[PDB]
Design a protein around this motif. Structure first.
Motif, PDB file in Angstrom:
ATOM      1  N   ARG A  42      -6.616  -1.886   8.410  1.00 41.39           N
ATOM      2  CA  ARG A  42      -5.362  -1.873   7.631  1.00 41.39           C
ATOM      3  C   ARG A  42      -4.188  -1.635   8.538  1.00 41.39           C
ATOM      4  NH1 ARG A  42      -3.660  -2.057   2.667  1.00 41.39           N
ATOM      5  NH2 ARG A  42      -5.505  -1.359   1.579  1.00 41.39           N
ATOM      6  N   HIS A  43      -3.142  -2.450   8.346  1.00 41.92           N
ATOM      7  CA  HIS A  43      -1.831  -2.211   8.897  1.00 41.92           C
ATOM      8  C   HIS A  43      -0.820  -1.854   7.802  1.00 41.92           C
ATOM      9  CE1 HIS A  43      -2.953  -3.755  12.772  1.00 41.92           C
ATOM     10  NE2 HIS A  43      -3.268  -4.938  12.257  1.00 41.92           N
ATOM     11  N   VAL A  44      -0.043  -0.792   8.018  1.00 42.87           N
ATOM     12  CA  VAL A  44       1.029  -0.403   7.077  1.00 42.87           C
ATOM     13  C   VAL A  44       2.337  -0.323   7.888  1.00 42.87           C
ATOM     14  CG1 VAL A  44       1.826   1.287   5.396  1.00 42.87           C
ATOM     15  CG2 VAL A  44      -0.585   0.958   5.740  1.00 42.87           C
ATOM     16  N   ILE A  45       3.360  -1.008   7.418  1.00 38.86           N
ATOM     17  CA  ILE A  45       4.680  -0.903   8.035  1.00 38.86           C
ATOM     18  C   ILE A  45       5.495   0.013   7.119  1.00 38.86           C
ATOM     19  CG2 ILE A  45       6.756  -2.009   8.867  1.00 38.86           C
ATOM     20  CD1 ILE A  45       5.157  -4.319   9.607  1.00 38.86           C
ATOM     21  N   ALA A  46       5.508   1.253   7.520  1.00 42.49           N
ATOM     22  CA  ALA A  46       6.129   2.274   6.718  1.00 42.49           C
ATOM     23  C   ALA A  46       7.572   2.557   7.186  1.00 42.49           C
ATOM     24  CB  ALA A  46       5.313   3.521   6.870  1.00 42.49           C
ATOM     25  N   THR A  47       8.376   2.958   6.233  1.00 39.58           N
ATOM     26  CA  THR A  47       9.747   3.380   6.472  1.00 39.58           C
ATOM     27  C   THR A  47       9.923   4.858   6.131  1.00 39.58           C
ATOM     28  OG1 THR A  47      10.737   1.251   6.247  1.00 39.58           O
ATOM     29  CG2 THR A  47      12.144   3.078   5.632  1.00 39.58           C
ATOM     30  N   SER A  48      10.447   5.621   7.094  1.00 40.45           N
ATOM     31  CA  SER A  48      10.867   7.030   6.880  1.00 40.45           C
ATOM     32  C   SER A  48      12.327   7.109   7.192  1.00 40.45           C
ATOM     33  CB  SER A  48      10.182   8.009   7.825  1.00 40.45           C
ATOM     34  OG  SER A  48      10.092   9.234   7.127  1.00 40.45           O
ATOM     35  N   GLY A  49      13.104   7.275   6.136  1.00 38.48           N
ATOM     36  CA  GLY A  49      14.524   7.415   6.245  1.00 38.48           C
ATOM     37  C   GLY A  49      15.045   6.177   6.884  1.00 38.48           C
ATOM     38  N   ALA A  50      15.499   6.339   8.100  1.00 41.19           N
ATOM     39  CA  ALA A  50      15.977   5.253   8.850  1.00 41.19           C
ATOM     40  C   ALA A  50      14.992   4.746   9.882  1.00 41.19           C
ATOM     41  CB  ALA A  50      17.235   5.690   9.597  1.00 41.19           C
ATOM     42  N   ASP A  51      13.778   5.242  10.020  1.00 37.55           N
ATOM     43  CA  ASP A  51      12.895   4.617  11.009  1.00 37.55           C
ATOM     44  C   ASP A  51      11.788   3.834  10.328  1.00 37.55           C
ATOM     45  OD1 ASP A  51      14.140   6.899  12.354  1.00 37.55           O
ATOM     46  OD2 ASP A  51      13.206   5.971  14.129  1.00 37.55           O
ATOM     47  N   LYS A  52      11.171   3.000  11.144  1.00 32.46           N
ATOM     48  CA  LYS A  52      10.020   2.199  10.795  1.00 32.46           C
ATOM     49  C   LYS A  52       8.876   2.499  11.732  1.00 32.46           C
ATOM     50  CE  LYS A  52      12.343  -1.752   9.079  1.00 32.46           C
ATOM     51  NZ  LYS A  52      12.808  -1.333   7.723  1.00 32.46           N
ATOM     52  N   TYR A  53       7.693   2.550  11.156  1.00 33.61           N
ATOM     53  CA  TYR A  53       6.444   2.803  11.855  1.00 33.61           C
ATOM     54  C   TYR A  53       5.370   1.754  11.495  1.00 33.61           C
ATOM     55  CZ  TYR A  53       8.674   7.349  12.635  1.00 33.61           C
ATOM     56  OH  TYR A  53       9.546   8.301  12.994  1.00 33.61           O
ATOM     57  N   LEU A  54       4.552   1.408  12.475  1.00 30.64           N
ATOM     58  CA  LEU A  54       3.363   0.706  12.225  1.00 30.64           C
ATOM     59  C   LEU A  54       2.242   1.691  12.261  1.00 30.64           C
ATOM     60  CD1 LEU A  54       1.635  -1.868  11.861  1.00 30.64           C
ATOM     61  CD2 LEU A  54       1.737  -2.145  14.283  1.00 30.64           C
ATOM     62  N   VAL A  55       1.591   1.848  11.115  1.00 36.10           N
ATOM     63  CA  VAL A  55       0.366   2.641  11.018  1.00 36.10           C
ATOM     64  C   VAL A  55      -0.838   1.721  10.899  1.00 36.10           C
ATOM     65  CG1 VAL A  55      -0.817   4.373   9.678  1.00 36.10           C
ATOM     66  CG2 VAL A  55       1.750   4.341   9.781  1.00 36.10           C
ATOM     67  N   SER A  56      -1.772   1.786  11.827  1.00 35.02           N
ATOM     68  CA  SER A  56      -2.993   0.977  11.803  1.00 35.02           C
ATOM     69  C   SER A  56      -4.291   1.837  11.783  1.00 35.02           C
ATOM     70  CB  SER A  56      -3.029   0.100  13.068  1.00 35.02           C
ATOM     71  OG  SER A  56      -1.818  -0.667  13.173  1.00 35.02           O
ATOM     72  N   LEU A  57      -5.174   1.528  10.830  1.00 35.60           N
ATOM     73  CA  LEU A  57      -6.435   2.197  10.633  1.00 35.60           C
ATOM     74  C   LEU A  57      -7.578   1.228  10.705  1.00 35.60           C
ATOM     75  CD1 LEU A  57      -8.011   4.767   9.669  1.00 35.60           C
ATOM     76  CD2 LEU A  57      -7.689   3.833   7.394  1.00 35.60           C
ATOM     77  N   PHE A 109       0.889  -1.147   0.000  1.00 30.49           N
ATOM     78  CA  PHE A 109       0.000   0.000   0.000  1.00 30.49           C
ATOM     79  C   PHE A 109       0.957   1.235   0.000  1.00 30.49           C
ATOM     80  CE2 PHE A 109      -2.407   3.184   2.343  1.00 30.49           C
ATOM     81  CZ  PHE A 109      -3.568   3.179   1.613  1.00 30.49           C
ATOM     82  N   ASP A 110       0.828   2.145  -0.964  1.00 31.31           N
ATOM     83  CA  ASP A 110       1.746   3.347  -1.040  1.00 31.31           C
ATOM     84  C   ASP A 110       3.179   2.854  -0.963  1.00 31.31           C
ATOM     85  OD1 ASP A 110      -0.616   4.767  -1.067  1.00 31.31           O
ATOM     86  OD2 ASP A 110      -0.563   5.487   0.946  1.00 31.31           O
ATOM     87  N   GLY A 111       3.457   1.757  -1.622  1.00 30.13           N
ATOM     88  CA  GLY A 111       4.828   1.245  -1.617  1.00 30.13           C
ATOM     89  C   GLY A 111       5.268   0.512  -0.404  1.00 30.13           C
ATOM     90  N   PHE A 112       4.429   0.280   0.600  1.00 24.89           N
ATOM     91  CA  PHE A 112       4.929  -0.343   1.810  1.00 24.89           C
ATOM     92  C   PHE A 112       4.194  -1.671   2.003  1.00 24.89           C
ATOM     93  CE2 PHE A 112       4.954   4.354   2.906  1.00 24.89           C
ATOM     94  CZ  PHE A 112       6.339   4.521   2.816  1.00 24.89           C
ATOM     95  N   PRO A 113       4.812  -2.590   2.754  1.00 20.68           N
ATOM     96  CA  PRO A 113       4.136  -3.745   3.217  1.00 20.68           C
ATOM     97  C   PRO A 113       2.897  -3.363   4.019  1.00 20.68           C
ATOM     98  CG  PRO A 113       6.435  -3.894   3.728  1.00 20.68           C
ATOM     99  CD  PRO A 113       6.204  -2.535   3.225  1.00 20.68           C
ATOM    100  N   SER A 114       1.836  -4.069   3.657  1.00 20.27           N
ATOM    101  CA  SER A 114       0.549  -3.793   4.210  1.00 20.27           C
ATOM    102  C   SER A 114      -0.417  -4.997   4.173  1.00 20.27           C
ATOM    103  CB  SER A 114      -0.036  -2.641   3.422  1.00 20.27           C
ATOM    104  OG  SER A 114      -1.193  -2.206   4.093  1.00 20.27           O
ATOM    105  N   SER A 115      -1.305  -5.007   5.152  1.00 20.55           N
ATOM    106  CA  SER A 115      -2.478  -5.879   5.174  1.00 20.55           C
ATOM    107  C   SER A 115      -3.746  -5.107   5.401  1.00 20.55           C
ATOM    108  CB  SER A 115      -2.311  -6.833   6.331  1.00 20.55           C
ATOM    109  OG  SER A 115      -2.428  -6.227   7.610  1.00 20.55           O
ATOM    110  N   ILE A 116      -4.792  -5.541   4.759  1.00 22.85           N
ATOM    111  CA  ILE A 116      -6.150  -5.041   4.999  1.00 22.85           C
ATOM    112  C   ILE A 116      -7.086  -6.227   5.044  1.00 22.85           C
ATOM    113  CG2 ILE A 116      -6.618  -4.531   2.525  1.00 22.85           C
ATOM    114  CD1 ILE A 116      -8.212  -2.181   3.673  1.00 22.85           C
TER     115      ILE A 116
END
Ligand SMILES: [Cl-]
Length: 176
Positions: A134-149, A110-117
């Motif tokens: 939806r879960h998105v495991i996003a990368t910003s630079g050197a960090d990783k975030y879990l975004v859940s909606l 999703f938007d280029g990142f690993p994701s599940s819905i």
């Protein structure tokens, strides 16, 4: 094409991999630019009582005893792990809900990142809810975030609130 895991919710798998989850809050947050559409008549819910909430929006003027809402949660992830592997646990927290039935599932990026819905119905307080998770495991630079909606409605409102929940689910966007 991507096979799901069955053991361990996404959060527990990341715990067991030694990752720490730190709940973010929107004021000041820059690592990601997240769009969460706000449909007509919906508003941000001050003081939501969703632990770890990043933002909660809701249609407070709805009919239904259940207020239609979307909940966004954003965790910075500390420790290394493989995201594509973690994401295969992405359905499991929804599939544990009482009487879960599935309507739609995907593990496409999703938007280029690993994701599940996963979308479907479940029971809570003697009521059937329809939800989209939806879960998105996003990368910003050197960090990783879990975004859940989560976007949830009473099942009886799933068609009436369709344009709201749709604009939220399909307008959702996460950018580094
Ligand atoms: Cl930030």
């Amino acid at each position: 094409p991507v096979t799901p895991a069955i053991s361990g919710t996404l959060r527990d798998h990341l715990r067991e991999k030694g990752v720490k989850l730190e709940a973010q809050r929107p004021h000041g947050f820059k690592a990601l630019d997240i769009t969460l559409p706000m449909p007509p008549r919906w508003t941000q819910v001050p003081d939501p009582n969703v632990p770890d909430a990043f933002v909660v929006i809701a249609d407070r003027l709805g009919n239904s005893v259940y207020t239609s809402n979307a909940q966004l949660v954003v965790y910075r992830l500390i420790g290394d792990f493989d995201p594509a592997e973690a994401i295969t646990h992405g359905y499991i927290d929804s599939q544990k809900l009482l009487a879960w039935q599935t309507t739609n599932a995907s593990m496409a990026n999703f938007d280029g990142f690993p994701s599940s819905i996963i979308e479907g119905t479940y029971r809570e307080n003697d009521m059937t809810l329809n939800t989209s998770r939806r879960h998105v495991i996003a990368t910003s630079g050197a960090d990783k975030y879990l975004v859940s909606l989560s976007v949830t409605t009473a099942l009886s409102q799933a068609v009436t609130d369709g344009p709201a929940t749709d604009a939220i689910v399909n307008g959702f966007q996460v950018v580094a």
